[PDB]
Scaffold this active site. Structure first.
Site, PDB file in Angstrom:
ATOM      1  N   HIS A   1       0.675 -10.126  -3.200  1.00  0.00           N
ATOM      2  CA  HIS A   1       0.411  -9.787  -1.797  1.00  0.00           C
ATOM      3  C   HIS A   1      -0.063  -8.560  -1.642  1.00  0.00           C
ATOM      4  CE1 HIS A   1       3.919  -6.937  -2.773  1.00  0.00           C
ATOM      5  NE2 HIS A   1       3.698  -6.093  -1.481  1.00  0.00           N
TER       6      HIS A   1
ATOM      7  N   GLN B   1      -1.271   2.947   1.055  1.00  0.00           N
ATOM      8  CA  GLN B   1      -0.253   3.069   1.781  1.00  0.00           C
ATOM      9  C   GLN B   1       0.530   4.062   1.348  1.00  0.00           C
ATOM     10  OE1 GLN B   1       2.310  -0.535   1.280  1.00  0.00           O
ATOM     11  NE2 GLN B   1       3.220   0.654  -0.694  1.00  0.00           N
TER      12      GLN B   1
ATOM     13  N   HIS C   1      -0.226  -6.084  -9.400  1.00  0.00           N
ATOM     14  CA  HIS C   1      -0.964  -5.362  -8.265  1.00  0.00           C
ATOM     15  C   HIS C   1      -1.730  -4.285  -8.755  1.00  0.00           C
ATOM     16  CE1 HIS C   1       2.242  -7.180  -5.920  1.00  0.00           C
ATOM     17  NE2 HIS C   1       3.230  -6.375  -6.079  1.00  0.00           N
TER      18      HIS C   1
ATOM     19  N   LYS D   1       3.577   5.948  -2.478  1.00  0.00           N
ATOM     20  CA  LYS D   1       2.325   5.995  -2.570  1.00  0.00           C
ATOM     21  C   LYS D   1       1.724   4.800  -3.199  1.00  0.00           C
ATOM     22  CE  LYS D   1      -0.385   9.227  -4.261  1.00  0.00           C
ATOM     23  NZ  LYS D   1      -0.527  10.626  -4.838  1.00  0.00           N
TER      24      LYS D   1
ATOM     25  N   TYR E   1     -10.873   9.130   1.515  1.00  0.00           N
ATOM     26  CA  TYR E   1     -11.498  10.482   1.882  1.00  0.00           C
ATOM     27  C   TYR E   1     -12.181  10.849   0.205  1.00  0.00           C
ATOM     28  CZ  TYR E   1      -6.893  11.867  -0.405  1.00  0.00           C
ATOM     29  OH  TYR E   1      -5.744  12.247  -1.141  1.00  0.00           O
TER      30      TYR E   1
END
Ligand SMILES: NC(=O)c1ccc[n+]([C@@H]2O[C@H](COP(=O)([O-])OP(=O)(O)OC[C@H]3O[C@@H](n4cnc5c(N)ncnc54)[C@H](OP(=O)(O)O)[C@@H]3O)[C@@H](O)[C@H]2O)c1
Ligand SMILES: NC(=O)c1ccc[n+]([C@@H]2O[C@H](COP(=O)([O-])OP(=O)(O)OC[C@H]3O[C@@H](n4cnc5c(N)ncnc54)[C@H](OP(=O)(O)O)[C@@H]3O)[C@@H](O)[C@H]2O)c1
Lengths: 485, 485
Positions: A173, A367, A235, A338, A373
């Site tokens: 996911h 997330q 992931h 995080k 950045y």
């Protein structure tokens, strides 16, 4: 304009109740599904749509103005009771689907919201009894996909003997998350990120998954697979592939997945020398769950050595990445939530600033608080000449305040309706993933090393920082950021 | 710890009153000057320090708490009356300086706040009569440095026959601005800007100077030099050099200026084919000054053809920049106040996004609202896959809210005290600058082409946009930015 049937196998379970039914409602509500769509639940319990509505509607977050849409949604819902390996039951389900509007012609999407112990029986019976002879047939499978190379081999072999690869939609996911999908656009739509994305400019890549809570009284389930199977083999490795892949021949799904598999094929099996494992213990100064360690979960076996934290270094042995460490770092009961991709660039060559510069970094925060950045050097503002660290920033919460970012399952389920497999795990991807980690997983199982303790709420074992420094990551602690509100 | 004497030649004039005396006060007030510093004014008028204080203190913005510092500052001030080519007068000034505390030993800094018509006489008499035999001697000269190659030749030759290059501080005040000084750190302290800073990645460079007001009833002075001498041959060309220069051997002042001159030596004389000139006319729909054109200034000669706008394309004919157009665009009575450096990068090679991408841009906004940002491509946020333009941003007003950014003259005068010539124009720099523009300036003088009219408050003549498109700049109008407050 074709009829589409969305079959929720395991419709009585918690995943269906809290995630799959709400997600298909949200897509329906938003006008994103084909006009002629029906939802069929299938599970063992003798339920009605009224029961499905009572259980799941609390998670719909429906508004009063959605009343008519809600009534149409549930009018398009039905439920078939049956066992998962009972031929007659699947014959009833097939006849039920045929009896829907143009049901013989409809495209059929089967969501397996089921435990993996019934995957083989469910896929076998779907193939035997419930396939459309006219429309397409797609099956959505969630993890675990085995526990190692051998066990994933067997599941994959069973499913592939029945379904073509273009019928199998394996969910990771994270591939549905906004910033993970952005990795390909950032890399391949921008000259400012093109010529620097290589070993001549990048000193190390860090892929991070952190959660600030522990197992929350559910450690007994976690204990059987551990953090590497839970978060790293899937992931983090997916994020590695998108960061590392060569540019695909097109954005066609299998041109993209071709390049992801190609990355994995250049990663050798990880060895223990490049691995740090931790297990969290309680913080006596904390409050609530923070005072409890992993072993303080009464569902965890006494004396368990299961790791709740892992830092692992991989290498992609190809021309773009030779020698660049890819650091995969993840754990529970850490200091923050995080998920993040970080590139640390090499020092500038031929320093003219008397050792005052720090390595540039590119950060893609998946997330929370989606952002991109680049940490870079600017002249210290004011009456000074020395370089100082600053950043160029894009924060979605401020740049795109009113833009809804869809949940991963909203995006991925819609992709199955549309036939896009780009963000789903291909069979050969899965095999390489298990190839890379299985020797380590077997050594952990065999030798049962004791993980390094770390206090709940900390950054994890300091040995993980030492490993990162050893392979080339540099941390100075000099960068100071405060929010421009 | 040595005595320093700051001599303001032309101390009665408006530049001294409103800029130089306030600036040396601000440096004094802030503790940035040597402890034993004295200020000596010199001009024709028979004035006292009381008169100097009455005229300039209104521009000091002094606070009540600065009373004691102010009294010490004026106790350290004195004034000598005299003519600018009168030997006896400079003998009086020299004896006056000798009589100060350790005046024979002091370092002497002469600021020529004078019209250029007295530069030769003033520098001659300073050299003959007022040089310290022990301390260093530095002279600060402001523009104009001639009107063309020949006239700058003569001034430079006169000054260099008297003063060494390490005694001459020629001001281009843009070299004192925060973001102009930042160009060298951005380029040479960052790997993210290193390997892309070349012709393989950059399609065009744009250097912009815009003001939204006209000549404000002072056009008669402007009319004698025009916009190219006013802003392009100096400020814009300086920004070109810092953008284009190779990396210097060190940040030593003449290693840096070596690289700036080297750039200019690869620029051929500009020809009229690469030039667009404009002159502003009144806006009948405007208010106030906006209704008045350049010729509506009664101090401007009737029928003047002087340009108030210029767009010029230069090329740096070397390995890094071959074929990359450098667009220098400037003018009065335009739509905004802005000074800016912009890099437009080439298209990404091998497009996989079906022509949806736009060229990346790097923008360094010098003023107002100092900022650096890169326009780039991100996945369109939400349930979309197409790339869309966004940006990574650094805005000083929000990142560094409480950091005072010093005026250019504060920074530059302090550099003279410290002996740093990096941000001052060297003799050979000046010569190359005049070499590049003098054939065009002479053709304009000889043939007097009529500039293209453009309405007050517009972006200038549309022919300037056509010139920019011809050489390779691409404008789409698709980028949408709104401030994250
Ligand atoms: N748009 C935005 O929201 C935005 C923009 C810029 C900065 N910030 C915030 O400013 C803060 C600092 O930015 P940053 O984290 O990117 O830069 P940083 O503080 O310099 O940290 C860089 C990396 O070093 C790691 N680290 C910390 N201590 C370490 C140690 N002893 N040894 C080895 N590694 C160590 C950190 O791990 P961890 O992952 O465990 O922290 C982090 O990944 C962050 O909270 C960031 O969210 C936010
Ligand atoms: N930190 C910040 O403050 C920040 C950050 C990002 C964006 N912004 C603002 O967002 C707005 C748009 O950003 P942007 O100006 O960089 O991008 P842009 O609007 O896409 O313009 C890019 C360049 O194209 C020029 N241009 C406009 N119309 C043209 C035409 N018909 N033909 C040829 N060139 C044309 C513009 O000239 P001109 O120089 O005359 O405009 C500008 O230099 C700006 O006002 C910017 O200040 C601010």
């Amino acid at each position: 304009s074709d009829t589409h049937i969305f079959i929720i196998m395991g419709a009585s379970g918690d995943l269906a109740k809290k995630k799959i039914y709400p997600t298909i409602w949200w897509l329906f509500r938003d006008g994103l599904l084909p006009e002629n769509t029906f939802i069929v639940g299938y599970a063992r319990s003798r339920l009605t749509v009224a029961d499905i509505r009572k259980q799941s509607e609390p998670f719909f977050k429906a508004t009063p103005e959605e009343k008519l849409k809600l009534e149409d949604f549930f009018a398009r819902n039905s439920y078939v009771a049956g066992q998962y390996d009972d031929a007659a039951s699947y014959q009833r389900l097939n006849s039920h689907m045929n009896a829907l509007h143009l049901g013989s012609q409809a495209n059929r999407l089967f969501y397996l919201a089921l435990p993996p112990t019934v995957y083989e029986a469910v896929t076998k019976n779907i193939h035997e009894s419930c396939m459309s002879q006219i429309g397409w047939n797609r099956i959505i499978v969630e993890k675990p996909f085995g526990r190692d190379l051998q066990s994933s081999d067997r599941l994959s072999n069973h499913i592939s003997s029945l379904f073509r690869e273009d019928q199998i939609y394996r969910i990771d996911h994270y591939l549905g998350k906004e910033m993970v999908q952005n990795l390909m656009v950032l890399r391949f739509a921008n000259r400012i990120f093109g010529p620097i994305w290589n070993r001549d400019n990048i000193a190390c890549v860090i892929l991070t998954f952190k959660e600030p809570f522990g197992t929350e009284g559910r450690g007994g389930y976690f204990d059987e697979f551990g953090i590497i199977r839970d978060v790293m083999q899937n992931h983090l490795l997916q994020m590695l592939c998108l960061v590392a892949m060569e540019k695909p021949a097109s954005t066609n799904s299998d041109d993209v997945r071709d390049e992801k598999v190609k990355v994995l094929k250049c990663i050798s099996e990880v060895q223990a020398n490049n691995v740090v494992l931790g297990q969290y213990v309680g913080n006596p100064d904390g409050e609530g769950e923070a005072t409890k360690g992993y072993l303080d979960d009464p569902t965890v076996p006494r004396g368990s050595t299961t790791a709740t934290f892992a830092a692992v270094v991989l290498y992609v042995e190809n021309e773009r990445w030779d020698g660049v460490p890819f650091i995969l770092r993840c754990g529970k009961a850490l200091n923050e939530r995080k998920a993040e991709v970080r590139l640390q660039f090499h020092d500038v060559a031929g320093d003219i600033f008397h050792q005052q510069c720090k390595r540039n970094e590119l950060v893609i925060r998946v997330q929370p608080n989606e952002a991109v950045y680049t940490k870079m050097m600017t002249k210290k503002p004011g009456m000074f000449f020395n370089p100082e660290e600053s950043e160029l920033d894009l924060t979605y919460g401020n740049r795109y305040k009113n833009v809804k970012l869809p949940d991963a399952y909203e995006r991925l389920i819609l992709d199955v309706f549309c036939g896009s497999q780009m963000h789903f795990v291909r069979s050969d991807e899965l095999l390489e993933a298990w190839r890379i980690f299985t020797p380590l997983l077997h050594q952990i199982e065999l030798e049962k090393p004791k993980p390094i303790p770390y206090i709940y709420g900390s950054r994890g074992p300091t040995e993980a920082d030492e490993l990162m420094k050893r392979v080339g990551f540099q941390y100075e602690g000099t960068y100071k950021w405060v929010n421009p509100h």
